[PDB]
Structures are given as C-alpha cells and as structure tokens.
UniProtKB/Swiss-Prot annotation, chain A:
One of its GO terms (cellular component) is extracellular exosome. Originally identified and characterized by its inhibition by the diuretic drug amiloride. It is a multi-pass membrane protein. It comes from Homo sapiens. It is linked to Liddle syndrome 2: A form of Liddle syndrome, an autosomal dominant disorder characterized by early onset of hypertension, hypokalemic alkalosis, and suppression of plasma renin activity and aldosterone secretion. Bronchiectasis with or without elevated sweat chloride 3: A debilitating respiratory disease characterized by chronic, abnormal dilatation of the bronchi and other cystic fibrosis-like symptoms in the absence of known causes of bronchiectasis (cystic fibrosis, autoimmune diseases, ciliary dyskinesia, common variable immunodeficiency, foreign body obstruction). Clinical features include sub-normal lung function, sinopulmonary infections, chronic productive cough, excessive sputum production, and elevated sweat chloride in some cases. Phosphorylated on serine and threonine residues. Aldosterone and insulin increase the basal level of phosphorylation. The keyword NADP does not apply. Glycans are attached at N104, N389. The gene is SCNN1G. Its main location: membrane. It is found in: Apical cell membrane. This is Epithelial sodium channel subunit gamma.
Swiss-Prot record, chain B:
It comes from Homo sapiens (Human). It is found in: Apical cell membrane; Cytoplasmic vesicle membrane. GO terms for molecular function: ligand-gated sodium channel activity; WW domain binding. Residues 1-424 are extracellular. GO terms for biological process: aldosterone metabolic process; artery smooth muscle contraction; cellular response to acidic pH; cellular response to aldosterone; cellular response to vasopressin; epithelial fluid transport; erythrocyte homeostasis; gene expression. The chain holds residues 78 to 512 of 640 of the full protein. This is Epithelial sodium channel subunit beta. The lineage of its organism: Eukaryota, Metazoa, Chordata, Craniata, Vertebrata. The keyword Metal-binding does not apply. Keywords: Cell membrane, Cytoplasmic vesicle, Disease variant, Disulfide bond, Glycoprotein, Ion channel, Ion transport, Membrane, Phosphoprotein, Sodium, Sodium channel, Sodium transport, Transmembrane, Transmembrane helix, Transport, Ubl conjugation. Originally identified and characterized by its inhibition by the diuretic drug amiloride. Belongs to the amiloride-sensitive sodium channel (TC 1.A.6) family. SCNN1B subfamily. Changing A223V: In a colorectal cancer sample; somatic mutation. Glycans are attached at N172. Detected in placenta, lung and kidney. Expressed in kidney (at protein level).
C-alpha cells in the first residue's frame, strides 16, 4: 500500500508541443463541388419546416408521432398538427424528427428540435462522403500554415510556418503543431510571463465556413507532450475570433507506484494491443487503437473518426451498407465494458499535464483597430489584398505562469 | 531527514489583495498635447508603409525628424545575398515585404558612430516596439507627480463596488503608478490598514466590481488590447502585474474562483531560500513602497542596478534610487542602445537569477476563470441608467455601453491547501 506527496523546483524549463487547428475543417468553396448535391437535399429538407410547400434514400429522415411507438413516417410524406407546459415560450411538439439505422433489427435517433436533426443527419452524409476521399486531396484541400498564421514569436525570436509540423486530422483538416519538429532541439523558457512565451496571430475567414456544420468562428489549440497524440476531437481549448486568448499554464508532472492493486505500465509493452497512432503510449490511445481494431475485426472496415489500421478500408455506406448499425453495436458494447479493450488496457505510470489558466481580452482595441488591421494586411500583403475585418483574426498567447517543476510523487508504506 | 505535511479544506481567512489596471496607461485626451508630434510622425510612417501613393513631399517633410533621427526604422533588404541593402524609410514607391526583407531598428551610441540593427520579421511587431520605445523616451521627461494625473482616475474607472455585503467606493483602494499601466488600484492591500477577512465561499461573499474601461480615450498606437489587467497577490506585495496578471474582457461578467496554496522550503542546500530578503546584496529599490522582499523585486532592481552602472541612468519601467534619473535621450543620447545590450546579453539575465535568492513563505492564488455576456436584456437599460446617474456626478456627463467590465472574485468551496517541506 502507498502514500502521497507534492514537491516542486525552479529550473529553466522546456516548452510543450502546441497544436493549432481551424475549427472549420476545409475551405467551403474548395469542397463545395463534392457536397453541392447534399447541400440541395438539406436545404430542401429545411425548406420543409415552415414557409414553403438520392441521399435521403439511404438514411431516410423520419417523423415520429409521440402518440405511438414502432410507428414512423417519411419526412417528405404527409403530416399535420402541441403538448402543454408551464413570456412563456416553452412547449413540447407532439411530433419529432429523427432517422434510423438497420442491419440485414434497427436503432434510431430523435431530436428535441427539427433543425437539430437535419444538421446531425447532414453530418452523417458528410462523413459518408469524405471517408471516400484520399488523404493527399484532403491535405491539398485544407488550410496551409503560411495562410493560417499571420505572425508568431517566442521570447522575441521569430517563427515561420516552417517551424510547424503538419498533422492532418480526419475531422479538423490540416492541424499544425509547434515545437515538435524531429531532430531539432526542443524549445525552453528562462523567463515566465507572456512576452517570453509563444504569441501568434491566426487568420480565420468566416467567409469559407461551410454553413451546415454547427460551430463558432474560431480555432482549437491543444497542449501536449512532444511525443503525445492530440485527440483534437475531445480535449482542446477553443479560441474565439477578435480576442486575445492568454493561455497561462503551470507544468505538472505525475507519478504512481506499481502494485498488484495499483497497476500501470511505463511504455505499454505489457498489453497485446498494437498502437496505430504513431505516438507514445497512453490510456486513451490504447483504448481507441483497440477499438478500431475490434471494429475492423467485426465490421470489415474502420471508423473514419480515427486513424486507419493497416490492411483496412475507411467505412462508408456506399461500400458497407450495414456499417453504422455494426458501429452502434460495438460502441454500446464498449460502453457496457463488454469488449476486451476496457479490461486489458492500463494507465501510464507517469505523465505530464499543462494545467491551463485561460483568460480573454478584446483585440484590437477599438482605437487601435484603425491602423493595426491595415498593417496586419501589409504583413501577408502579397498573399492577401483585402482589408482584414476585425472578426477575421484571433490573437493567442501561450506562456508559463512560473518556471516551477510542480509534481506529485508517491512512497510505499 | 525530511518531513512533510498536506491538507485541504475551507476556513475563514484574509482575503487576497487584488489589483485593477486599465490597459491604456493614459487618457489620450489628457496627454496627447505631449504626444502630438510623435503621433503625427507615426501617421506618416504608417502612410509611408501602407500606401505611399497617397503621400506628398510637401505634406510629409514638415514632420519632426529630430524624433526620427534618434532611433529610426530601416528596411533591411537582403533578398540579394550577394549584396544586401539598408534603406531609411525617409513606378510605385511601395516598400518591400518579400521573404528576404526585414524591418529593423538602428539603435546607436557614441555620437552614433556605433550602431546595431534589431530585427523584427513583421511590421506589426516593429511599429509597436518602436512607438513604445519612443513614447517611453517622452514619458521619462515628465515628473511623476504630474504624470499620475494623466492615468484613468479611480473616480472614472470604478463605477460600482461591493465586498460581501459591505459598501465601497474608489477612495477605498490604494493607488500606485505602475509605470507600464499608469494608475493601478489595489484593493485590500493590507499595508495602510488591517486586511479584510471573508467568512464564506461563493460569489455572495467575494468582490463585486463594475468597471469602466473608457475605450474611447485609449492611447491610439499604444494599448492594443482592451479590458482590465487584473492580478491576485498577498498583502504588501508590489505586484508585478505586467507578467503575472490576468485579463478580463469588456461586456462580460468575468467571474474568478479562488483557491490558496502555501509552501515553505526545506533549506539552503535543497534550495537557497531566504526568509525576508535581508541577506541579498541587491538594493531592493522597491522598498520605498514598503513591500516585502520577493524574487521578482530582486530581479528587476538588479537589472536596474546594472543599468545605473553601465548607462549612468535608470530605465523608465523600474523605480529609481532616489539620487538617479530616468533616461531621456535629451540627457543620455545612447540610452536606448545601452539598454538593449542589457536586454540581449543573457549573462545579465542569469547573473541576477543567480544572485537573487528564492522567497520562503510561498503563497499562490490558483484561479478558475469563467464568463458570460453582460448585461443581459433583463438588466441593461435600468442598470445602465442607475450607472448613468453615477456618471452624471461628473462635472459634465459622459456615457458608453461598450466600455463596462463586471467582476466577481471569491473563494471556492474549499479555499486552502497548506503544504510543507521541513528538515528533521
Ligand atoms: C521636435 O519635438 C521635440 C519634442 O517635443 C521638440 O522639443 C522641445 O523643444 C522645446 C524648445 O527647446 C523645449 O522647450 C524648452 O525646454 C527647455 C529645456 O528643455 C526650457 O529651457 C525652455 O524654457 C522650454 O521649455 C521642449 O521641452 C522640448 N520637448 C521635449 C519633449 O523635449 C523639438 O523642438 C522638435 N524639433 C523639431 C526639429 O521640430
Ligand atoms: C481492406 C482493404 O481492402 N483496404 C484497402 C486496401 O486494399 C488498399 O490497398 C488501401 C490503399 O489505400 O485502401 C484500403
Ligand atoms: C492543391 O493543388 C492545386 C493544383 O496543384 C493547387 O491549385 C492548389 O493551390 C493546391 N492547394 C494546396 C493547399 O496545396
Ligand atoms: C512564514 O509563515 C509562518 C507561518 O506559516 C510564520 O511563522 C513565519 O513568521 C512566516 N515568515 C515570513 C518571513 O513571512
Ligand atoms: C530578517 O530575518 C533575519 C533572520 O532570518 C533576522 O535576523 C532579521 O532581524 C530579519 N529582518 C527583518 C527586517 O525582518
Ligand atoms: C512606508 O514607506 C514610506 C516611504 O518608504 C515610509 O516613510 C513609511 O515609514 C513606510 N511605512 C509605513 C508604515 O508607512
């Protein structure tokens, strides 16, 4: 059995790996020609809600009267007519929109608000399409570093797009990562506070967001160890446009003792699960990597929301009709801890985490706006010719609050 | 041998000391008479970068190049490796911004016989750095007792204030001229008076502040960011809000939950820890503010000390030992260069870092920050009318809605985590 402790020291310190991603995965105009057909059926659907009189054939939208169960009706077929509730503007609609999935018996979804259903339904067909496009075309089709980043600095030293590793994410496009280029010295800070950390100005043109994906105009960032995997879909911090985001941070280093009643691994060598992520071991990695494998074993393909195991295709209805139901089964089984993954996988015996302490400020200030934006388009001035609008930019600072090597340590008893 | 202790909980205790500062160190309308020429020059520089075709020799060459000659910008054109070129900014006249073109300041000394180019890879960086340095060269010439009046007075900033249930008004804060932000207002500093306690967690028992930024009066080319700078710290600490401070955005009810850590170190061979700073050889210039010792204070005064040796002068952003003087180029034409050396030579970072001992009795205020837009429609008009009648107490009324920040600063449901390192 074990006991706990806390300790810290004040050495000049190494800097984390910083990943940046535009929340909008692809320049809308550059994907439009792939999606236009779907952008007709969606709008036709929305046009069905109020004010007006092939994809739908695969995943048919449905209207469910809560008067009945096992009874559902085509969203484009006939309908008419409200359940009371306690100005007052809340009521529950007797009808509700949804869609279903089947294997050949079926499983469904239904959404509080019609418009919400459509936008989920759209997200399905969006993936059902993009899963069929090759990586090179995607990477060519998403943002480039030299246009995503307007400027950046680190302890006054400048940085170019050169200093960023490309990292393509299936759901967020071209993410870029600072301070983790291979065979180069990891950056470090000898001073705490903003002006000694990373500062960068992002460009985020709302004009190219594809409307049918719900999001705010902004960018994600993730802080992680150089050999670690971002998991952009989950753990990131989003940045709103037209603001400073001052992400101060403390480093924290964690450790745990190995006992039969306190198990862990130093590098994952203990588990049979192969690691498909090309990144250091971690509980989340070993789980998902096991999940993808279990899926390929029983649905003949891999989920598009994750990297792709070897000798497998990315799932898509057009090639695997019973795909989504198969997925649904597994995911539920996984949540029910029925799949082996949840049992044989284990934590790391030690890890680092950057405890963030974010805060926001309006930028540029209303007076400064009159000149700063012109200059910020003389910078980048051969790549862009518009006068940038305030909402096209976002300023970001990453910096250590204090150069303190905080840690948590254990001793046996 | 070693010994340790650990804990968590809540208890009635002394509230932090809190500082508020406006991000623009001066009310433009109260100082532009002193910056008119610099701004006029700045506008031309921008014109001469952004759109030269709009310029005219009979319009530009009226300007006060005696300011420019002190520390000019230059284009470094090195996209011809076999022959680089340097151009002072004073069929198109458009200046280069290609890959091989860099924007730089030519710092100089010794009747400007010696000079060094300081680089920036973007105009936005260069221009801000330049203006800041020029402005600094002007502010130094002003006696503080007058300059203090050109910052936002508390009477304008702190529209409304409350502490738990207890009443409040700007006169309850202490005022210090923190040179990078002008007037900073410290709450509950515990220096002049006994510090306030607080009995309970939750917003109902913290600070409530409603602050007015007055964006319309910011110094145009300074102060790129809007919203109050804010910091928490122990009683009788300076604080060094330029580095350790949080922001809070206008038009929001930025709400800060607080949690306290405290630590003491084991001893010198485990870390050179001093109890009250009486050991170190550094003069600790800040002592006129009766603050305690702190690693920060020692570093900065150490920097200032070296500069008083190397440049017979003291830089504007740090206090002065009473006999010395701030660095006007009028009086020390080489100060900018002399200063830059102490910035660039990392040996001068480390010699102080080696000389200044760590502070014992460490105290840290962990913060969790949260926001929501404010006021909502259910509150705006009538609260802003109430506050309008607060601003109506001005000799002549002035109003705005874009400029108001609201803060809540309070302890979390557990408010202390004592920890210890002790020899045994
Ligand atoms: C460019 O602008 C500078 C900065 O304002 C001008 O400097 C100003 O010069 C006047 C006249 O010399 C100064 O007023 C006088 O100061 C002396 C002592 O310094 C005093 O004995 C006189 O009674 C009078 O007050 C003024 O202080 C000074 N301003 C600053 C900030 O130094 C300069 O004239 C302009 N040059 C050109 C080429 O346009
Ligand atoms: C299971 C399966 O057939 N997977 C295919 C594989 O045949 C092909 O070589 C690969 C090339 O990208 O695409 C995937
Ligand atoms: C994609 O490739 C096409 C053709 O080479 C080119 O026009 C376009 O600029 C490329 N975009 C990116 C981001 O590589
Ligand atoms: C440090 O705090 C301890 C109590 O935790 C107190 O006994 C001691 O006097 C304090 N010393 C200083 C230098 O503040
Ligand atoms: C500082 O502490 C030392 C011992 O640590 C003590 O001798 C001295 O009197 C103290 N001085 C002040 C000013 O507190
Ligand atoms: C505060 O500082 C001033 C100037 O350093 C000094 O005159 C005064 O005695 C100090 N102490 C108090 C309690 O005011």
């Amino acid at each position: 059995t074990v006991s706990v402790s806390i300790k810290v020291h004040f050495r000049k310190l190494d800097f984390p790996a910083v990943t940046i991603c535009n929340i909008n995965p692809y320049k809308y105009s550059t994907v439009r020609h792939l999606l236009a057909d779907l952008e007709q059926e969606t709008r036709e659907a929305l046009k069905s809600l109020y004010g007006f009189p092939r994809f739908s054939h695969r995943i048919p939208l449905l209207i469910f009267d809560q008067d009945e169960k096992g009874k559902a009706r085509d969203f484009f077929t006939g309908r008419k007519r409200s359940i009371i509730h306690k100005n007052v503007m809340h009521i529950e609609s007797k009808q509700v929109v949804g869609f279903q999935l089947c294997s050949n018996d079926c499983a469904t979804y239904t959404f509080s608000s019609g418009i919400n259903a459509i936008q989920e339904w759209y997200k399905l067909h969006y993936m059902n399409i993009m899963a069929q496009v090759p990586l090179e075309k995607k990477i060519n089709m998403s943002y480039s570093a030299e246009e995503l980043l307007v400027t950046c600095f680190f302890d006054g030293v400048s940085c170019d797009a050169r200093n960023f590793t490309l990292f393509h994410h299936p759901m967020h496009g071209n993410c870029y990562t600072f301070n983790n280029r291979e065979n180069e010295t990891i950056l470090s800070t000898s001073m705490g506070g903003s002006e000694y950390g990373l500062q960068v100005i992002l460009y985020i043109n709302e004009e190219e967001y594809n409307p049918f994906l719900v999001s705010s105009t902004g960018a994600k960032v993730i802080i992680h160890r150089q050999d670690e995997y971002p998991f952009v879909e989950d753990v990131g911090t989003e940045i709103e446009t037209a603001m400073v985001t001052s992400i101060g941070m403390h480093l924290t280093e964690s450790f745990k003792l190995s006992e039969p009643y306190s198990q862990c691994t130093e590098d994952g060598s203990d588990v049979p699960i192969r690691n498909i992520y090309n990144a250091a071991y971690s509980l989340q990695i070993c789980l998902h990597s096991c999940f993808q494998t279990k899926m390929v074993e029983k649905c003949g393909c891999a989920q598009y929301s994750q990297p792709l195991p070897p000798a497998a295709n990315y799932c898509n209805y057009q090639q695997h009709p019973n795909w989504m139901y198969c997925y649904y089964q597994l995911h539920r089984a996984f949540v029910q801890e029925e799949l082996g993954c949840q049992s044989v996988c284990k934590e790391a015996c030690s890890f680092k985490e950057w405890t963030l302490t974010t805060s926001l400020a309006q930028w540029p200030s209303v007076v400064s706006e009159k000149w700063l934006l012109p200059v910020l388009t003389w910078d980048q001035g051969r790549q862009v010719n518009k006068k940038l609008n305030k909402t096209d930019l976002a300023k970001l600072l990453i910096f250590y609050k204090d150069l303190n090597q905080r840690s948590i340590m254990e001793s046996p008893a | 041998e070693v010994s340790v202790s650990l804990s968590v909980g809540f208890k009635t205790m002394d509230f932090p000391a809190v500082t508020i500062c406006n991000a623009s160190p001066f009310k433009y309308s109260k100082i532009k008479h002193l910056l008119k020429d610099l701004d006029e020059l700045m506008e031309a520089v921008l014109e001469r970068i952004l759109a030269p075709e709009l310029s005219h020799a009979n319009a530009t060459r009226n300007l006060n190049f005696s300011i420019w000659n002190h520390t000019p910008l230059v284009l470094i054109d090195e996209r011809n490796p076999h022959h680089p070129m340097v151009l002072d900014l004073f069929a198109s006249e458009k200046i280069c911004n290609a890959h091989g073109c860099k924007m730089a300041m030519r710092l100089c000394s010794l009747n400007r016989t010696q000079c060094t180019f300081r680089n920036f890879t973007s105009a936005t960086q260069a221009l801000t750095e330049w203006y800041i340095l020029q402005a600094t060269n002007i502010f130094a010439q002003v006696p503080q007792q007058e300059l203090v009046e050109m910052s936002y007075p508390g009477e304008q900033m702190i529209l409304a204030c409350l502490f738990g249930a207890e009443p409040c008004n700007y006169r309850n804060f202490t005022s210090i001229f923190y040179p990078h932000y002008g007037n900073c207002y410290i709450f509950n500093w515990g220096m002049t008076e006994k510090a306030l306690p607080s009995a309970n967690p939750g917003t109902e028992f913290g600070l409530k502040l409603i602050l007015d930024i007055g964006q319309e009066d910011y110094v145009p080319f300074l102060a790129s960011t809007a919203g109050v700078r804010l910091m928490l710290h122990e009683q009788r600490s300076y604080p060094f809000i330029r580095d350790e401070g949080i922001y809070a955005m206008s038009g929001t009810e930025t709400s800060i939950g607080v949690l306290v850590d405290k630590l003491q170190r084991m001893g010198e061979p485990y870390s050179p820890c001093t109890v009250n700073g009486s050991e170190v050889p550094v003069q600790n210039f800040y002592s006129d503010y009766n603050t305690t010792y702190s690693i920060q204070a020692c570093l900065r005064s150490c920097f200032q000390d070296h500069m008083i040796r190397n440049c017979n002068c003291g830089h504007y952003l740090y206090p002065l030992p009473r006999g010395e003087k701030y660095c006007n180029n009028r009086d020390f034409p080489d100060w900018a260069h002399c200063y830059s050396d102490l910035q660039m030579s990392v040996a001068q970072r480390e010699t102080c870092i080696g000389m200044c001992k760590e502070s014992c009795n460490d105290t840290q205020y962990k913060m969790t920050i949260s926001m929501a837009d404010w006021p909502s429609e259910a509150s705006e008009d009538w609260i802003f009318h109430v506050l309008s009648q607060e601003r109506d107490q001005s000799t002549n009324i002035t109003l705005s809605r874009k400029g108001i920040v609201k803060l809540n600063i309070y302890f979390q449901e557990f408010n202390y985590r004592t920890i210890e390192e002790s020899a045994a």
